[model samples]
Target: SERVLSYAPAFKSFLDTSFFQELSRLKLDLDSTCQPLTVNLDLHNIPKSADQVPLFLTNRSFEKHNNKRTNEVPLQGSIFNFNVLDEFKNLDKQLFLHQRALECWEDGIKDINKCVSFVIISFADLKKYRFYYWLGVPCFQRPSSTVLHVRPEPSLKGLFSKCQKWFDVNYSKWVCILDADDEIVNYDKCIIRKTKVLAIRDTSTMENVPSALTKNFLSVLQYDVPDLIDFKLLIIRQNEGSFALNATFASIDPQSSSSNPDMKVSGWERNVQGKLAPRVVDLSSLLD
Candidate 1:
């Protein structure tokens, strides 16, 4: 069975609080050396107070409100309604706040340079999510890519497009490369999820598209990201597991290993061997 964990009671309370639900934004530092510090509000937890409906089902009053419940099983806190903390002495749920707090701490480790910070602007509440990054720390007023556009898949192109747009429109900065969509939420989580280094290019070499230019936007992607999407080659590489394999292609003789001095492995063969070297339990297939 997969090892499951619980959220911090305090933080969970914080997330469910009316004040936090009405929050405008949240700041997340990608590469902070210090322990993750997120300010949260303290709210009174009540199982079933007067006129209050329990969100969880454990409360006696919950039978009246037949609202759909999420799969989340609350340990101690009454599900249907929360009774005021002053009146309710004991909590049914164990406060696992430290575990969750530490997870957030670990996420900060992936980004070695603490340059990226996010602006989580909530138009509605926490239910509908829309997020954007400030690129650098103190909020870069303009965001390049409109995350508003609903793309079928959040590809590297889509992600890079955002960073590229941000850098271009704000400061005409060319070096825009990052992984923001996929990251660990906290220290316990291996935050670098969905990291894919598809490709890189020097955008300065290409022509700028007038329509794309906005504020301080530059034509950085012109040279960096290839104009054409070669689906055939992409498919082949996907099968071969060597798309964007390496930028440098050697034209010299393959260096002989100490043990296999007579045989030579060069260029594309070297790449293939380097990748599938372990799978080649028997070289007889190649000889045949």
Candidate 2:
């Protein structure tokens, strides 16, 4: 509310070809593994604001803030740190970060390595990544910035179900899954925006995924939408399975609904060992 609504644009700049090339090199680390690594490079595609969500409060203000800001205010020459590679190699940390295989698509790995599977990733991390992918900033602004954009419930569920169904249907294609909230920057959009998807995390606004992981299978999942609402579908398939051990990729139908006002629908959110917990563990620590 306060953080998003209180900004104004002060300066602006154009993206040159050289600048784009350099940024690409910096974010991906494709050419030089010697370069630093951080989650900052992946936050390039997020939107600037969402007046709808309650988290945008800067000092908890809702109105009368500054929006004026200079165009393209870079946080640092690069927010990456040497610890990135170290973290990835830490086995504990790397597995924790990529635990759920956020977008499971491992060509050389197995999807369900143990027959029992767990989503090693954290939902909070997914929330951060989803927003980052939608809006390039670390956090969204509030007030006059933009209204909250509600995503379709049925569409989201349908997308989830369809993804699960595809593998079962084909049985031959190894599928790897990646959701919207997993990673923010899309390679295609990065080119269009001419902004680098830095891999560094904004610790102030978000944190890394938690360490606890879970194993699950979808016997069946349903997102009950009122008869009055519209809906969409998302489907996915895995042919070669993935490296994450337990993760699935998905694709959705165009008719998917993106938001719901006050409707309450119950569906299979998770499938544990013969049981499902309606609410996950408390995640307040991730915010701090």
Candidate 3:
């Protein structure tokens, strides 16, 4: 079996002051929105060759914020804040993630590539100046999938060069170019034309491994486009370091799993000790 050794992608999470200001603006100083509310996190389309990519929240991440970036892509993430530290820590990781994965699976039907989603569970202790948080990005624990080969495609540079609005105009995270032409279409449209090859707005630099979003992309494709078990994948980045690959997936059946949860989930952020736990930040010197 030529299975690709996958790396569960991680992020260098940054919660900015501007994001807090905007949160206060929305929450009315002391409160906020939905229990498992909808939130957007912006990932700067900048590139790197690391497993842990840099991701941050800014004022612009919120639709309410004043600025926006063409060099950024908004990841649709779920928010479930707690009133106390105990509730945040006591959260059922398995139950929490399975729900979001189901929603992504459902949404994947329409646009398979953009089906990946994120989740943030936390307790923002405003008075104590403590921001206790943890991040979870979901992907199915598939039994079989393999990468045959991968390498950068320089010709894509000319295609991207001509399409000045490649990232500027499209709000979606990934798209396809099809063997037919250079025009890029979101997965929604690409699927209609019968997606021949995948072009991702990738942020990963790891060799054989791809970004978490790409993993999520595949998660949806496996179920929604089951016939598309083997295909080509393109990784497009702003750094002139984009690459392509040939990959395939085998039969995926979940009999040894959950009905409360149909499949196994991955991508829970680990602590420095490599344990599944909440990360607490005290803004250590807010008084100073």
Candidate 4:
């Protein structure tokens, strides 16, 4: 094994019964017959423990359909309600998800890290009110850059009011730059000297591991800004304390992703048995 630091999933899907009812209504009204089949859903903020982050789709989730956001941040998703089970099973999910990640690359560092895409595929027997559905939580794989020989330490005991104002105001910016004096600054005013710290909000509640955003954010940064390869990475959280990492980027090759069959992506959530499987809901009798 290469011994690389990573963020395995700590979340699952949470679609409600009411959501299915509403989905039925939409399908009946022929609204499901539209293009760009993306429906935005809410993701409860990732905090405390890795216990059910409420991937649940509510009736309200159906109302917004495309332009929805959680109370905290936006959790984006796609729905493919197919006519046949074969079409659902035979979807080239890896290729489809890579196309989604390529859009994140277009987003650059602005919202790429924050916008981890999820997917739901299903075939509903409207007559019977039965549903066969599966959820896919895609985490972009960046094997090109390895966190070789990196270590983190705790510091910045008391924060500043100005820094608080910036984070509270523009936290949507994802990552920010710290000046040479360790004072916080937005992404624009940087590089008077390159050794300042780069900061990311530590969204993961995991003990040691950072969230899935960590690798993808850094990957995009390395692709966008090649300088400052060996710099400090600050992990900040409002709930608890903070820490810093010594990021020494190694084992990267530009334009060398001849690649897999396509961009390497991991989706397909494992069911309760911890196996790759689709779930069945036989609400034909109980559904009403």
lDDT of each: 0.20, 0.21, 0.58, 0.57
Give per-residue CA lDDT, model 3, range 37-135, as digits (tens): 333333344344445456666565566433266644556675566666677677788888877777777777676655676777777776766777777
lDDT of 1 by residue, 1-288 (tens): 111111111111112232222222231323211112222111122232211111221222212233222212121111111122221223221122222222222332332122112111111212233211100011110111211111122243424334333433323121223345532111111222133222221211111111111111111211122231211100001011112121111122433333321211111111123341111112222223
For each candidate, C-alpha RMSD in Å?
Answer: 27.0, 23.2, 4.7, 4.8
- Superposed by TM-score, candidate 2 places the C-alpha of residue 281 at a distance from the truth, in angstroms, of 26
lDDT of 4 by residue, 1-288 (tens): 123455646246766787667667666433233212333322224435553344666566645444433224345566768776677678776676676666665565554445465667777777787888777766554554445335764454125234434555553455676666666766542341364466765555555566665666666656555554566666554434445566667763433545532335665777778888778776676434
Alpha-carbon deviation at 196 in model 3, angstroms: 2.3
Q: Which pairs of residues collide in model 4?
A: 14-55, 14-56
- The regions of model 3 sitting more than 4 angstroms off are 8-10, 18-52, 59-67, 141-165, 179-183, 188-195, 251-261, 284-288
Question: Model 4 segments beyond 4 Å from truth?
Answer: 1-3, 28-52, 65-71, 109-115, 142-148, 156-171, 188-196, 252-262, 285-288
lDDT, residue 243, model 2? 12
Assess candidate 4 and give its TM-score to the true structure: 0.74
The worst-scoring run of ten residues by lDDT in candidate 1 lies at 231-240
Cα-lDDT of candidate 4: 0.57
List candidate 2 segments past 4 Å from native: 1-35, 38-137, 141-144, 149-158, 163-288
Candidate 3 TM-score, C-alpha based: 0.74
Q: Per-residue lDDT tens digits of candidate 2, residues 188-280?
A: 322212321111111111111100111111100111111212112122212111111111212122123454221111112222232322223
